[PDB]
Amino acid sequence: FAPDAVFGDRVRRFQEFLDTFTSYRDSVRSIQVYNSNNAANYNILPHRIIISLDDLREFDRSFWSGILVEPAYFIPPAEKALTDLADSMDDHPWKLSFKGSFGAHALSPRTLTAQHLNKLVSVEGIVTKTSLVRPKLIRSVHYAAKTGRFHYRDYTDATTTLTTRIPTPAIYPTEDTEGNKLTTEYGYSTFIDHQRITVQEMPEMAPAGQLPRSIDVILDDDLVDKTKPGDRVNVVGVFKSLGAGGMNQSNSNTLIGFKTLILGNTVYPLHARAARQMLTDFDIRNINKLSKKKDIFDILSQSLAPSIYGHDHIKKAILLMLMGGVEKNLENGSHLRGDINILMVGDPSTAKSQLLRFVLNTASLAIATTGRGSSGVGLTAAVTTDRETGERRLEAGAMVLADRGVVCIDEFDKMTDVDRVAIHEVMEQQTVTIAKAGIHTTLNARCSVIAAANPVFGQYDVNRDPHQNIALPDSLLSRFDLLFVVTDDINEIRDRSISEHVLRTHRYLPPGYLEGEPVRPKLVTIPFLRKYVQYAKERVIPQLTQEAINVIVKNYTDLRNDPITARTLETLIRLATAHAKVRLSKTVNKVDAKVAANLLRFALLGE
Amino acid sequence: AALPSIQLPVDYNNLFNEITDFLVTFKQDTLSGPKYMAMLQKVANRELNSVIIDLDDILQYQNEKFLQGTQADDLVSAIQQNANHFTELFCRAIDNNMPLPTKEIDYKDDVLDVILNQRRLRNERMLSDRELFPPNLTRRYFLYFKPLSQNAISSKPLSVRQIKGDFLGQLITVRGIITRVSDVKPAVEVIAYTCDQCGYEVFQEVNSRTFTPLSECTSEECSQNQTKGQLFMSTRASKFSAFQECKIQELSQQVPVGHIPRSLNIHVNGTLVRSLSPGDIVDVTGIFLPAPYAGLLTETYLEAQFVRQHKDVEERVMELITSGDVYNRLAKSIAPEIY
DNA sequence: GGGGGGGGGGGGGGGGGGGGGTTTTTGGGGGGGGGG
DNA sequence: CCCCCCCCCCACCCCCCCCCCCCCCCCCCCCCC
């Protein structure tokens, strides 16, 4: 059996498949006309199709299992047939991508195994250590100055091709066969963008006492930069080996293995329990319908953390912090931040960590940290050598990874102060500045910090002042929008209420499990709530209005003229703007200012 | 090692003729000799060391020729596609066309004139039975392509991460902040070697990051006598060019959410050197190019071509003196919005 | 008796083969400074 | 004044090179004019 003899039949079968499931023809033509229009109109869609692998199964199971189990012999004819289809459309090689029902080929960096080599696999994980993007040479063109002909040279390595074609040493020609001097023609020469990423096993999945495994993925052309570090991802590609594995006799070591990779074919970002949720018109209409209920802010904030009793004002502040106010840009590029920064300081067992963990599970983009476990460098960004090239490169820390998101900090007062010295620029300027290793840069860190802490004493001591109870400097506390003080203050009625709630919480049983089996008044669902937050963040930018200003200045002057400072005012503006986002309203109004002042009054006065 | 070959939609003999016709024809007549021949006359007088080719001029030349009904092969698109080769073509057109000086410059003190004059005398004696040089040695000017004004790829201000690999070889304009700059260093264009055992110098043009020094005298004054004379490098007779490496970084508005600000090396040569300072926010036009070091992965840089920066008194001070109330108003003008 | 030709040695050139090519975290000791 | 804390410093192609082989050149010897 030799692959070439069956290539033609495989081509025409995939051509019949594409002709049958004509949605792929429509997709090819849609991409082509989009690109033609945008080329002429003076941004470009890629020459790539995602085929539902189910369609290919229902068409021809033999070819489908060929794609799965022998992709090196079945993807090239499929892509040739697709390229011929694109050629058959009116007026470059087209590439394939896959979705659905991989079965045993759905894996993780742990359970991916040497038995899977050269098969098409899907791996779920979290991205780390993305390389720099580099152009990879695939063809070079040379004008032979005397001869007049344009010579050329193709290139190959184990990453460029699904099959192990003979390597080409990356040398540019310099002389014709007759010895005539060549000149290399860039612009006619062809380079693909190339990127190498490490997908790490999800820590929730790793078995007892083992650390996460990881594997390296190669991404080419339009797949490049589709992910950043910290992205949870599903990658589909061909799992391969490459290199000599020490069989080349210069290596004396008997025991080292072969290098292995996934050559990527598609990359899906994830937050299934998708990173950006799709909204049907049904979702749009429901979201608007709920926004007109007169007490929607109470409904949504009560719907946050339904397993936490009480803490109503904190859950309200959390909701407005998930939906922070609009960021201002002014003359000379002057900047006013729009995040809402929350600090929960208080007695033990007051659900501060649980509220952080709810926020971590509810925001679109959240990064968890803990006081002892966090280095200041590990928080901002760290210099490392990119072994792909050998250059010093920055690795994003938690504050940078949370940009246009949130950061959770548990045990915040337990930080060493050289860590907290690195917090200040994120809070004050939404940025971090690097001036080391010959790297002199500034990075965006635009995110809501929400933090949990305890007093210097094990519990809050009402005999003493907040600056004496609270460990942090005033130069840091003033940067938080809302400073909440909570206590586990004993009271039989509240203790009865919280107790019976917690017992209901602990009596839960998830669906389908037997009694006692181990695991493997209107309120919205958390998926609905996540969709509502995404809608309000994307689709409404509330404009400030004088009727709201009147309430704001009245309340600010009243609060100040009885801890209050100038920063309190734009905090009130942020809280009002976020509440206007809760109403889905294009304007901030007197109701928003009233709620904002009520909530900040609770935070300051313990009202 | 043989190579295959292909046909392409370009012809450099034709485009060379198009370039030289442009060079002797165009002028900015709407502003009322040919613009470039006047500039080359200024080069001949050694008053100007830079030739700035405008793609706007090539567009207006193409529009004039197309209005006259001939095809013009869209030289603008061609030299936006493969700018590196067209620097060589434009320099060949100039080195052919460039007129003699109108003003005298005390020529006898120029070493390269003296050495090539001595070569010419010796070659006349040889030719009396008793090219002359590599062209870069005699080429005093530096040539630069200025981008298209917005009225297309050289016009667009890309961010660094938008410079995909597809743009290699093309003349592109990049918007960023200069994060660091090298001190100026002399790169070689043509190395010059004295020969101890015949006196007849020889030259090596260098097109690469590295070169190998010559040893045995290749000149027929030695080689025809099979005399294995020794070559020694001379700085005085070598053509150096001013070289400087800079690094541009994409601005805070260009960085996507949660990404590191990416950066790119800029190589600037000739008169364009030290036009870039760290902290400058700038548009730089250049040829985006590769350099081999990895295997097939490439180092890549921007060969700078044009720079656009983003950002009398002893009597004008009397405006404020006569305007009056100077202490109060100037005091209020410190941070005027601050109560 | 000197010059040419033939034969042998010695040197040089060319070709072919081969080998080499820094910051970030953690722990420990010692020194310095602050609070009761 | 004493003790504890906390701060600091430290750990695969291309060039150079070397070896081998072949041819050519130069000297010496012998013969011929």
Ligand SMILES: Nc1ncnc2c1ncn2[C@@H]1O[C@H](COP(=O)(O)OP(=O)(O)NP(=O)(O)O)[C@@H](O)[C@H]1O
């Ligand atoms: N209001 C509440 N309703 C339900 N459970 C609660 C509530 N308050 C505290 N708990 C429970 O208390 C436990 C500890 O919560 P946690 O969030 O770790 O407290 P904490 O405020 O972070 N304490 P600490 O980390 O010592 O400062 C969790 O199992 C919670 O379920």
Ligand SMILES: [Mg+2]
């Ligand atoms: Mg806690």
Ligand SMILES: [Zn+2]
């Ligand atoms: Zn010589």
